[PDB]
Design an enzyme around this catalytic site. Structure first.
Site, PDB file in Angstrom:
ATOM      1  CB  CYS A 149      64.627 -95.451 -43.594  1.00  0.00           C
ATOM      2  SG  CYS A 149      63.292 -96.495 -44.101  1.00  0.00           S
ATOM      3  CG  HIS A 150      62.635 -91.577 -38.361  1.00  0.00           C
ATOM      4  ND1 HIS A 150      61.856 -91.598 -37.235  1.00  0.00           N
ATOM      5  CD2 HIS A 150      62.143 -90.229 -39.048  1.00  0.00           C
ATOM      6  CE1 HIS A 150      61.101 -90.694 -37.173  1.00  0.00           C
ATOM      7  NE2 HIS A 150      61.294 -89.710 -38.060  1.00  0.00           N
ATOM      8  CB  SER A 170      57.383 -94.045 -34.303  1.00  0.00           C
ATOM      9  OG  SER A 170      58.671 -93.164 -34.444  1.00  0.00           O
ATOM     10  CG  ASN A 180      57.183 -84.464 -38.481  1.00  0.00           C
ATOM     11  OD1 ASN A 180      56.207 -84.803 -37.477  1.00  0.00           O
ATOM     12  ND2 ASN A 180      58.259 -84.558 -38.109  1.00  0.00           N
ATOM     13  CB  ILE A 211      48.279 -89.432 -27.300  1.00  0.00           C
ATOM     14  CG1 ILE A 211      47.431 -88.889 -28.426  1.00  0.00           C
ATOM     15  CG2 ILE A 211      47.995 -88.786 -26.123  1.00  0.00           C
ATOM     16  CD1 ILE A 211      48.312 -87.889 -29.030  1.00  0.00           C
ATOM     17  CE1 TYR A 212      54.899 -89.776 -27.176  1.00  0.00           C
ATOM     18  CE2 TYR A 212      56.263 -90.103 -25.346  1.00  0.00           C
ATOM     19  CZ  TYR A 212      56.279 -90.211 -26.405  1.00  0.00           C
ATOM     20  OH  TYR A 212      57.361 -91.027 -27.211  1.00  0.00           O
TER      21      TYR A 212
END
Lengths: 264, 264
Positions: A149-150, A170, A180, A211-212
């Site tokens: 499950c995610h 994640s 979310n 963080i990207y």
């Protein structure tokens, strides 16, 4: 009185300092720390962030689309919001367990309705623990038999209070996380409304929070901003069946956030 | 330098003050607060609590029994530790997915080995997130089709460090919580040993964390005690296959705890 967004902003500060760069599946790199918890009170308020604007409609929209259990994006995208797609969230919740082919083949009389059950268990044995509710990332279903499950949202009731705790595998702190929150919170805000309860707490547990690289600076800026008083959602009507929750049945009030922040 | 048990003791203090009494399934009452996180460093140390004694053998024992994938309690109880029983943990990990009848029917060539996979994914694509590993409470399997996992342990690697994060649906702070910690930690301490890694962190997420009425006082006493320097586990040997980890292959050192505490 405290503040909740502070929680968000806090971990963020943490991610940026002493978070390690790590590259994901796409190949893009990020900064991430394993394990994080945040508790947002849903009592006479709504955790719909203020140190940046959030696409409320974009939330309420998509949400109603999952609860309505549709796999057709047009059913949601038909309200300015972003040949078929596949078993997304609006199917793994209701028609799960039954072979899927397309969207115009009414499974009404098929699937193992994961959501109803919850709604029901609250009505039957609230003192229970296993009020869980899994969900998956479509990309993994055939990717490997017995796919993990995610996410999952264990529920919890007491003293007439419903309080969900979301655990994602994640986490995309940038623009994902903020979303979310108001999402599942909204959901929670609806369940309790039809299950004669009162909103309690939101807890957001995470596995790989990150963080990207191309997100740092804006967030660095996002920090300077200072959280404002949180909204307050009002369900302008009385319902009892989760499937009638119409779009215009919510009214966010007390929402004055800081300017948007286009993130990639 | 900080301290970790402090974490435990801390939440405990929290449970006892302003935790609400709630009665479970058995009918017995408890005090519980929804949602809790703790991070125990497994670097050059072992989170095997000191403000009370822990049944190390009882841990290592049972653990090896699950990894060995046996449903026969005698395989574990044959070492002074507590017609068959059923699909416990020592089966939902290895021979899961294949119809079970008894214990003397070698499923060697059956099941969807949940553990190996993990061990393997670390060997293949550590940068991944879905390193999860579900588990269930036997009492729920037929109790309801599509039964929700009792727990799950998402794994995480980086900079040559393996760090597990355990998320249990319900938590028995009294004598349960202390156990699992050294348990899953030990497991983690083994995986990394066979996956050319180094132990990182343990994170213990919980849904309904509670204290049992007949547990308060001893714990109240347990608080007064002061955490001592944590142990240090040593795997006195080199292995590569998870199924050869023999009992006497571990050596706890630096373990001097406070007296036991018989809890119900």
């Amino acid at each position: 009185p405290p503040h909740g967004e502070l929680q968000y902003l806090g971990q963020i500060q943490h991610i940026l300092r002493c978070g390690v760069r790590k590259d994901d599946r796409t190949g893009t790199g990020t900064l991430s720390v394993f394990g994080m918890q945040a508790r947002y009170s849903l009592r006479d308020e709504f955790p719909l962030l203020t140190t940046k604007r959030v696409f409320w409609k974009g939330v309420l929209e998509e949400l109603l689309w999952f609860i309505k259990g549709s796999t057709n994006a047009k059913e949601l995208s038909s309200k300015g919001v972003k040949g078929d797609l596949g078993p997304v969230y609006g199917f793994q919740w209701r028609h799960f367990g039954a072979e899927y082919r397309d969207m115009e083949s009414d499974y009404s009389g098929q699937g193992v309705d994961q959501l109803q059950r919850v709604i029901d268990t609250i009505k039957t044995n609230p003192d229970d623990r296993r009020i869980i509710m899994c969900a998956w990332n479509p990309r993994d279903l055939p990717l490997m038999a017995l796919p993990p499950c995610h996410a999952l949202c264990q529920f919890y009731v007491v003293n007439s209070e419903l309080s969900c705790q979301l655990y994602q595998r994640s986490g995309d702190m940038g623009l994902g996380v903020p979303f979310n929150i108001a999402s599942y919170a909204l959901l929670t805000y609806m369940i309790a409304h039809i299950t004669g309860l009162k909103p309690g707490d939101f807890i957001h547990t995470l596995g790989d929070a990150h963080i990207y690289l191309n997100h740092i600076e804006p967030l660095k800026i996002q920090l300077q901003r200072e959280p404002r008083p949180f909204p307050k959602l009002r369900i302008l009507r009385k319902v009892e069946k989760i499937d009638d929750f119409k779009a215009e049945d919510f009214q966010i009030e007390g929402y004055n956030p800081h300017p948007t922040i286009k993130m990639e």
